[PDB]
């Protein structure tokens, strides 16, 4: 079409980081099928969204105000600071008051209504029919004892969000012709065979092998591999998994296509090589490197899918099976029970995952029965939304489209606040979808387009994977495009700015990394080289401003080249600082960002996100363990940015400043906090905060099995908020060393008010998380499968079961954690010292 449309597809390609019109690494048209398929869902949502609210994207929650936040409001009054150039009043408000109805208690209380309240220095609005106590920014300020500063100004023009117009009962068999690799001369000559598996929801329905042969640059067999399973019995979503054993290579091919047709014809698939379980193994995409990759040739020639009340003790066996964690293995007995009492099972939403693990997906009639089961879904459709449960049906174990769709059905009812909490994991979850186009993928696209905040992170979460996952960049790219084609020219403009910026800093970051070895030091030479490179961008290259990717509410302006530098650490990360591009800003404090290479940030994001879930969990029990999950977004391979927490120091650096360089003293920390405390009130506040934050992290860290940390990866704010960092990748359950204890007023396994307060918070926090054992267990395993390398689909994922002390009662749990606390006391500084 118009040269205009080509220039647009060019722009999109740049934002995405992939050409979705590319057909270099495909063997069918699913992707294209999918691009077209998403048009409707896109358009249906664009069309449905209120142009006004979409432009102002208010950030609101339906959850009640925690108890620990009402404490700061013991007068049913809240002070809002309304600025107006040099003006600035202080209208006292009621937590129930609406933004439109405090703008009344202003305009009239002072004395024309085409105005809207906006947070000073931010792109955050307090609009919409919502209690001011329900806006997040407001709760952010209460939780941090900050004043609410707002500016009266004109609503953003929803015209700016304009969208560009668009325009057989035979047995199954497969013939393995042979394998080919360009170069293979290796050490000791080993043997090699091909394993052809038919899988569904990671479950082998049938398995056939070829005879062992000499591993040469070309091995042929020309042998038909026949399976017992009928062509009429293959389940949609079934995957023909082909692997080469010496396991060296793998590759999958959807047995039924996106059009319900049985795969047929000759295929030459370029395989993935295992690096000397995880999501990546389930991919329907083929290695893009056709030149230096192993490949397997095959031939397919064969469309389809054209009362009784439980006795007392059996219902008991059933209920026990249902109460077991999601990691409890299911016995044949168990599956037969769940299946036979198929309809009783159907009354227990918590049984759903276990029940669908009990279906024989390899049997046409049974699956057939299963669908009839899901038909009478009344109970499920009326169940109180259980995210944990919903996610479980979205993991690697369920490949069935109808099973997965009901989980998504449940997600529909999440308010935006909630989608943000799980947004990163839901996105990862897409690696578990058998087809590109899926209910999940559509959910995301929708939720994205309907709210700007959610689309923004969706953008970056997808970009993250598209830039470094060979196994899923294709699918993720088609989804992202879809989104881009509907977020709005405005968004499309912001993204452009953000992409050019980080794309420059990434180049400088890497080039600088070359001019520096590993041996920590950092010379003025390398810093001089940085300042020069930045100077160059400061010119006509680096846009005037851009949104901070991990904090869309913040607009960043020009670099403060004088405050930038290269950090003296193993990796050589940039420490940039920018001026806030918002005049209405309430400060002159710069925005500090860290650009690093060497670490896999996608992992970091995952932990950080799980950390925020843990917060919300503790919220619903009136707890605030003061964690500090800083901004973090992986932008490419082993590269990305990190929010610079203001006024914080490494606990190691604190020790180093007192004792030797590579040298440990017990009072260092307490000394540091007191000297950093402006008054005695704030110093006492900071010891408090330390006790809470210390317990939060000791608990969060224990559950996620990443508590045994080195001193240089644990920070603390001058205000006392302790917090770990770099979750890149004798023992101790967590870090609770003598110096942390000293701050609490105890030493040599003694006692004190603070230490007992600490132990109280820990246990309270710990059993609060056990109240969500299932939600966490499912987040932990999905994390392991889409974030780590080859995670043991057993022992690894199983840690969290023992950590959350599954099975034990609350008393034995509390007992259990307190003992963990003692193991830290007995170890003192042993482990810290050892960390080398």
């Amino acid at each position: 079409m118009s040269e205009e449309s080509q220039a647009f597809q060019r722009q999109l390609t740049a934002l995405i980081g992939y050409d979705v019109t590319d057909v270099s690494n495909v063997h069918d048209d699913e992707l294209e099928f999918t691009r077209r398929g998403l048009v409707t869902p896109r358009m249906a949502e664009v069309a449905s969204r209120d142009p006004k609210l979409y432009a102002m994207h208010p950030w609101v929650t339906s959850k009640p105000l925690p108890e620990y936040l009402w404490k700061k409001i013991a007068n049913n009054c809240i002070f809002i600071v309304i600025h107006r150039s040099t003006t600035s009043q202080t209208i006292k408000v009621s937590p129930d008051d609406t933004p439109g109805a405090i703008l009344q208690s202003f305009f009239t209380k002072m004395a024309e209504q085409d105005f809207v309240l906006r947070v000073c220095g931010r792109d955050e609005y307090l609009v919409g029919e919502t209690p001011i106590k329900n806006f997040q920014w407001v709760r952010h300020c209460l939780k941090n004892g900050e004043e609410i500063h707002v500016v009266l100004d004109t609503p953003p023009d929803p015209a700016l969000d304009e969208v560009r117009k668009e325009e057989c009962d035979r047995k199954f068999r497969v013939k393995i012709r042979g394998i080919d690799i360009p170069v293979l001369p290796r050490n000791t000559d080993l043997t090699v065979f091909v394993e052809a598996n038919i899988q569904h929801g990671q479950q082998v329905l049938c398995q056939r092998r070829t005879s062992p042969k000499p591993f040469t640059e070309e091995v042929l067999w020309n042998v038909w591999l026949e399976f017992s399973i009928k062509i009429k019995d293959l389940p949609k979503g079934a995957l023909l998994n082909l692997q080469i054993y010496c396991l060296l290579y793998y590759v999958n091919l959807l047995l039924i296509d996106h059009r319900f047709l049985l795969r047929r014809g000759e295929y030459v698939l370029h395989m993935w090589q295992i690096s000397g379980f995880n999501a990546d193994k389930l991919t329907s995409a083929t290695n893009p490197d056709k030149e230096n990759s192993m490949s397997i040739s095959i031939l397919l020639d064969n469309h389809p899918i054209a009362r009784a009340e439980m006795p007392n003790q059996l219902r008991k066996q059933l209920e026990a099976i249902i109460a077991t964690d999601p990691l409890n293995p299911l016995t044949a007995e168990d599956k037969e029970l769940l299946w036979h009492f198929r309809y009783e099972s159907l009354k227990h939403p918590k049984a759903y995952p276990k029940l669908f693990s009990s279906v024989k997906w390899g049997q046409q009639e049974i699956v057939a029965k299963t669908y009839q089961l899901l038909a009478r879904r009344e109970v499920w459709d009326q169940s109180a939304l259980d995210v944990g449960l919903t996610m479980q049906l979205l993991d690697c174990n369920f490949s069935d489209e109808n099973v997965r769709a009901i989980a998504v059905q449940k997600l529909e009812s999440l308010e935006d606040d909630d989608v943000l909490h799980y947004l990163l994991q839901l996105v990862q979850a897409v690696k578990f979808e058998p087809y590109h186009d899926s209910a999940l993928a559509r959910f995301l696209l929708k939720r994205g387009l309907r709210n700007k905040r959610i689309g923004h992170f969706l953008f970056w979460f997808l970009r993250s994977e598209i830039a470094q996952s060979r196994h899923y960049q294709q699918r993720f790219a088609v989804i992202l495009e879809a989104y881009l084609r509907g977020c709005g020219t405005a968004m499309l403009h912001d993204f452009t700015q953000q992409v050019q910026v980080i794309e420059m800093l990434q180049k400088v970051t890497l080039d600088i990394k070359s001019l520096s070895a590993e041996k920590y030091d950092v010379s003025s030479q390398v810093i001089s080289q940085l300042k020069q490179k930045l100077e160059n961008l400061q010119n006509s290259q680096l846009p005037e401003s851009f949104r901070v990717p991990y904090d869309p509410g913040l607009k960043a302006g020009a670099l403060a080249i004088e405050k930038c530098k290269v950090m003296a650490s193993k990796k050589k990360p940039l420490w940039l600082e920018f001026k806030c591009a918002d005049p209405t800003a309430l400060s002159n404090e710069t925005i500090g960002i860290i650009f690093k290479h060497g670490d896999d940030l996608r992992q970091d994001m995952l932990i950080l996100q799980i950390l925020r879930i843990m917060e919300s969990i503790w919220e619903t029990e009136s707890l605030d363990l003061c964690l500090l999950p800083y901004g973090c977004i992986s932008t490419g391979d082993k590269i990305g940015m990190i929010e610079i927490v203001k006024d914080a120091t490494t606990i190691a650096k604190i020790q180093q400043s007192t004792v030797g360089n590579t040298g440990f003293k017990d009072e260092v920390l307490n000394h540091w906090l007191k000297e950093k405390s402006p008054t005695e009130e704030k110093f006492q506040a900071a010891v408090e905060r330390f006790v809470y934050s210390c317990a939060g992290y000791c608990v969060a860290t224990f559950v996620l099995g990443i508590g045994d940390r080195h001193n240089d990866n644990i920070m603390i704010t001058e205000t006392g908020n302790l917090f770990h960092i770099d979750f890149g990748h004798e023992r101790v359950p967590f870090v609770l060393t003598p110096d942390f204890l000293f701050v609490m007023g105890t030493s040599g396994k003694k006692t004190s008010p603070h230490f007992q307060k600490f132990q109280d918070i820990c246990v309270k926090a710990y059993l609060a998380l056990r109240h969500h054992t299932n939600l966490l267990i499912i987040l932990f395993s999905m994390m392991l499968m889409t974030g780590m390398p080859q995670l043991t689909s057993k022992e690894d994922i199983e840690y969290i079961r023992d950590a959350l002390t599954v099975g034990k009662n609350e008393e034995d749990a509390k007992k259990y954690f307190l003992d963990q606390i003692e193991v830290c006391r007995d170890k003192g500084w042993t482990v810290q010292f050892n960390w080398f």
Side-chain angles (χ1 to χ4, degrees):
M1 47 280 106
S2 274
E3 207 297 286
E4 214 292 67
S5 58
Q6 288 144 50
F8 179 66
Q9 180 60 58
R10 163 178 170 170
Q11 193 199 181
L12 294 169
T13 301
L15 283 166
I16 295 175
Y18 197 74
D19 193 352
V20 300
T21 75
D22 156 77
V23 294
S24 294
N25 190 49
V26 282
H27 65 205
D28 74 36
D29 66 340
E30 201 188 337
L31 294 175
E32 251 306 303
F33 178 66
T34 305
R35 293 183 64 202
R36 298 181 177 79
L38 301 185
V39 178
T40 297
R42 159 151 74 283
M43 305 200 290
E45 186 56 43
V46 174
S48 168
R49 77 181 174 206
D50 172 52
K52 279 213 204 67
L53 288 166
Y54 178 62
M56 298 183 269
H57 64 280
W59 187 359
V60 174
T61 169
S62 290
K63 315 177 193 58
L65 225 206
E67 289 176 46
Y68 59 70
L69 278 197
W70 269 113
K71 117 282 175 186
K72 187 188 171 185
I73 307 301
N75 51 297
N76 186 285
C77 287
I78 302 173
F79 323 114
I80 318 299
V81 184
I82 309 165
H83 285 58
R84 220 287 129 174
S85 290
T86 334
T87 328
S88 65
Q89 200 61 68
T90 319
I91 298 66
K92 200 147 58 183
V93 196
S94 177
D96 190 301
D97 301 339
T98 289
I102 71 168
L103 267 180
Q104 304 194 334
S105 67
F106 178 80
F107 276 150
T108 299
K109 185 269 184 182
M110 232 71 266
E112 310 175 304
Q113 303 246 58
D114 33 288
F115 289 159
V116 46
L117 292 164
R118 202 196 79 203
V119 172
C120 301
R122 276 179 172 289
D123 181 19
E124 203 61 61
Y125 301 83
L126 269 46
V127 306
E129 300 311 330
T130 307
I132 44 169
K133 76 178 174 77
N134 281 6
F135 290 76
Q136 275 306 144
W137 180 251
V138 167
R139 297 203 179 184
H140 163 57
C141 301
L142 305 172
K143 191 256 258 282
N144 288 307
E146 295 173 5
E147 310 188 319
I148 300 287
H149 294 77
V150 198
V151 55
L152 191 70
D153 53 316
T154 297
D157 191 45
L160 306 173
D161 295 325
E162 216 170 66
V163 175
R164 164 169 176 160
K165 315 181 195 179
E166 297 163 58
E167 44 70 57
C168 187
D169 296 73
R170 182 59 88 68
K171 282 181 162 177
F172 172 82
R173 65 169 181 170
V174 59
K175 184 176 217 175
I176 300 301
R177 325 218 71 152
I179 64 169
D180 179 75
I181 201 167
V183 192
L184 99 178
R186 49 74 271 288
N187 285 299
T188 319
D189 50 348
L190 221 297
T191 170
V192 142
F193 64 87
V194 169
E195 186 178 79
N197 308 282
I198 313 288
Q199 323 184 328
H200 195 267
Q202 263 181 180
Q203 175 169 74
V204 282
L205 300 187
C206 263
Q207 177 193 86
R208 289 293 181 280
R209 291 176 155 185
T210 66
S211 55
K213 280 187 171 174
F215 195 13
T216 68
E217 325 200 298
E218 182 202 47
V219 188
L220 301 175
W221 272 277
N222 185 58
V223 170
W224 278 107
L225 289 180
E226 188 171 65
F227 298 78
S228 34
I229 298 180
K230 299 200 174 186
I231 299 296
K232 199 83 172 63
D233 287 307
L234 295 171
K236 188 194 183 183
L239 289 185
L240 177 60
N241 166 260
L242 300 161
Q243 299 169 157
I244 302 175
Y245 285 100
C246 188
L247 178 70
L248 294 184
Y249 306 87
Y250 69 86
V251 86
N252 306 305
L253 167 76
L254 269 166
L255 288 182
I256 290 60
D257 66 20
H258 48 282
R259 297 192 162 93
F260 287 78
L261 295 168
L262 174 62
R263 216 113 243 178
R264 179 170 119 59
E266 300 277 343
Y267 292 89
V268 173
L269 312 165
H270 292 279
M271 323 173 79
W272 304 100
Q273 161 168 49
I274 288 70
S275 52
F277 313 104
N278 98 338
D280 282 357
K281 271 198 57 55
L282 315 158
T283 190
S284 63
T286 51
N287 195 328
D289 189 341
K290 275 74 172 72
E291 287 148 346
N292 320 300
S293 75
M294 159 67 83
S295 77
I296 181 173
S297 309
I298 67 287
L299 168 63
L300 236 49
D301 235 306
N302 297 298
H303 184 306
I305 319 98
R307 184 216 154 187
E309 175 67 56
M310 279 196 101
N312 186 59
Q313 280 81 59
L314 278 191
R315 140 172 283 121
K316 280 167 179 167
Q317 264 151 52
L318 189 79
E319 300 177 333
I321 276 52
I322 307 312
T324 69
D325 55 270
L327 295 181
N328 195 50
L330 278 190
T331 286
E333 247 244 73
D334 301 336
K335 308 192 191 173
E336 297 188 13
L337 241 194
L338 263 344
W339 181 253
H340 198 244
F341 296 97
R342 231 143 64 223
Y343 290 84
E344 180 51 44
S345 303
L346 172 151
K347 295 173 176 174
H348 307 264
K350 293 183 207 316
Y352 285 56
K354 300 275 184 47
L355 172 65
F356 301 123
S357 285
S358 311
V359 176
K360 293 205 175 200
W361 296 107
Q363 281 298 320
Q364 169 70 300
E365 291 99 307
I366 284 166
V367 165
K369 285 196 191 170
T370 303
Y371 286 16
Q372 290 180 61
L373 231 202
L374 295 181
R376 47 187 296 178
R377 205 185 311 146
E378 304 287 311
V379 180
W380 178 261
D381 295 339
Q382 308 176 324
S383 65
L385 171 63
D386 193 324
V387 182
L389 224 194
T390 310
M391 300 276 267
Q392 292 190 47
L393 301 177
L394 289 178
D395 81 348
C396 56
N397 305 106
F398 309 85
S399 285
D400 181 293
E401 158 192 52
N402 297 290
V403 164
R404 295 189 69 83
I406 67 175
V408 176
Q409 167 204 148
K410 242 56 227 303
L411 297 175
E412 293 292 346
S413 67
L414 291 171
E415 60 179 2
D416 290 321
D417 193 56
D418 281 323
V419 166
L420 284 172
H421 269 84
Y422 303 95
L423 184 55
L424 171 57
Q425 292 92 325
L426 285 177
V427 177
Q428 290 291 322
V430 169
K431 291 177 190 172
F432 299 121
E433 286 283 356
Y435 298 91
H436 299 325
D437 190 330
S438 49
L440 180 56
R442 295 192 179 199
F443 173 69
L444 291 170
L445 215 198
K446 273 181 282 174
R447 297 320 284 269
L449 300 171
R450 178 185 304 179
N451 182 296
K452 284 193 168 192
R453 194 182 174 58
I454 288 60
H456 169 81
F457 283 103
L458 167 56
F459 175 90
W460 289 107
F461 287 170
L462 291 175
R463 200 167 207 286
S464 170
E465 297 300 327
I466 300 176
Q468 54 190 306
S469 188
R470 304 249 68 164
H471 315 60
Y472 290 98
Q473 50 198 155
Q474 292 180 297
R475 179 187 295 176
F476 280 123
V478 172
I479 299 177
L480 207 222
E481 169 180 45
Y483 173 65
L484 289 174
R485 284 169 183 287
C487 51
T489 52
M491 298 270 297
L492 280 176
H493 156 64
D494 279 348
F495 286 133
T496 308
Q497 293 280 277
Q498 301 169 60
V499 166
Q500 306 185 320
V501 168
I502 69 156
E503 211 134 64
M504 289 183 174
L505 301 181
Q506 281 186 307
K507 290 188 181 179
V508 183
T509 298
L510 290 178
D511 307 343
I512 255 298
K513 195 67 184 293
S514 291
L515 312 185
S516 301
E518 180 58 274
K519 196 157 299 175
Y520 40 47
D521 47 62
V522 180
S523 71
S524 85
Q525 176 186 301
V526 72
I527 292 177
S528 171
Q529 291 278 161
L530 203 208
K531 302 209 163 184
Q532 305 183 208
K533 290 177 167 296
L534 289 178
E535 289 290 10
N536 282 177
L537 302 192
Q538 198 69 301
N539 286 28
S540 183
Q541 277 265 75
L542 186 160
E544 309 290 84
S545 68
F546 66 105
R547 298 186 172 296
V548 183
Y550 60 73
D551 191 3
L554 269 190
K555 258 287 196 66
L559 278 154
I561 308 176
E562 304 97 316
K563 298 168 183 186
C564 316
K565 64 150 178 281
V566 176
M567 306 204 257
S569 51
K570 292 70 176 194
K571 323 284 179 173
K572 302 305 181 185
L574 308 195
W575 166 290
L576 325 187
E577 283 179 32
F578 305 68
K579 300 187 177 73
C580 173
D582 206 302
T584 60
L586 213 74
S587 189
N588 325 242
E589 313 164 5
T590 54
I591 295 75
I593 299 180
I594 296 302
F595 254 92
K596 162 158 68 184
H597 166 82
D599 298 331
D600 194 4
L601 270 19
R602 287 170 300 184
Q603 295 181 57
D604 285 55
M605 297 187 284
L606 260 12
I607 295 303
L608 255 19
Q609 199 54 53
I610 296 178
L611 242 43
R612 302 195 178 69
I613 288 170
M614 292 170 152
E615 280 200 306
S616 76
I617 277 41
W618 291 319
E619 171 163 343
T620 86
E621 306 222 354
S622 300
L623 284 185
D624 189 349
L625 285 282
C626 305
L627 299 187
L628 187 19
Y630 51 89
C632 171
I633 300 176
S634 156
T635 52
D637 171 48
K638 289 174 295 172
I639 181 85
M641 54 178 71
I642 293 163
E643 171 193 333
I644 292 182
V645 173
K646 253 54 179 75
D647 288 321
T649 318
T650 277
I651 286 302
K653 233 134 296 179
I654 301 305
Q655 285 292 336
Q656 288 175 41
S657 289
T658 293
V659 198
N661 349 299
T662 319
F664 285 143
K665 304 199 160 197
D666 301 0
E667 323 100 302
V668 192
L669 229 190
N670 199 246
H671 287 177
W672 189 77
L673 273 178
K674 181 36 196 163
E675 93 200 28
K676 291 294 182 174
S677 295
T679 71
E680 257 297 299
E681 165 200 278
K682 289 181 170 175
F683 171 72
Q684 283 309 325
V687 177
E688 166 113 84
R689 203 175 185 62
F690 173 80
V691 179
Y692 275 64
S693 72
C694 175
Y697 283 94
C698 274
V699 183
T701 215
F702 177 70
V703 174
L704 286 170
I706 54 169
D708 202 334
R709 300 282 258 153
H710 166 44
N711 225 345
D712 184 47
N713 307 133
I714 290 73
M715 292 179 67
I716 182 157
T717 47
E718 304 196 321
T719 169
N721 213 329
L722 184 151
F723 74 94
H724 299 201
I725 66 179
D726 306 323
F727 310 92
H729 223 324
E730 281 189 291
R731 317 297 158 71
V732 73
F734 47 83
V735 173
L736 186 57
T737 50
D739 56 331
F740 286 9
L741 285 180
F742 190 83
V743 179
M744 286 176 222
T746 299
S747 75
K749 305 193 67 186
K750 210 171 72 298
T751 318
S752 66
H754 285 314
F755 177 70
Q756 296 174 162
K757 193 64 182 189
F758 166 81
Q759 295 173 299
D760 184 39
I761 310 171
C762 278
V763 174
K764 192 175 175 185
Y766 179 67
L767 50 81
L769 281 176
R770 286 176 77 275
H771 287 161
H772 298 260
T773 298
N774 295 8
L775 203 217
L776 295 182
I777 281 176
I778 198 71
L779 295 182
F780 189 61
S781 51
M782 298 195 128
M783 164 172 74
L784 296 199
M785 308 188 273
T786 72
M788 316 328 127
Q790 189 89 70
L791 69 321
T792 294
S793 272
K794 270 162 198 172
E795 280 224 53
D796 295 323
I797 312 294
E798 215 164 319
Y799 172 96
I800 203 155
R801 185 139 62 57
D802 296 334
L804 285 172
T805 205
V806 169
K808 294 299 177 174
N809 66 286
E810 281 214 352
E811 299 310 318
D812 296 326
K814 160 176 186 166
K815 157 68 178 179
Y816 179 79
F817 206 82
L818 292 168
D819 280 354
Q820 294 310 332
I821 291 284
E822 292 306 313
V823 181
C824 277
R825 296 233 277 181
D826 305 326
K827 256 86 189 311
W829 295 102
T830 306
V831 188
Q832 272 313 120
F833 173 75
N834 263 318
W835 269 109
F836 293 75

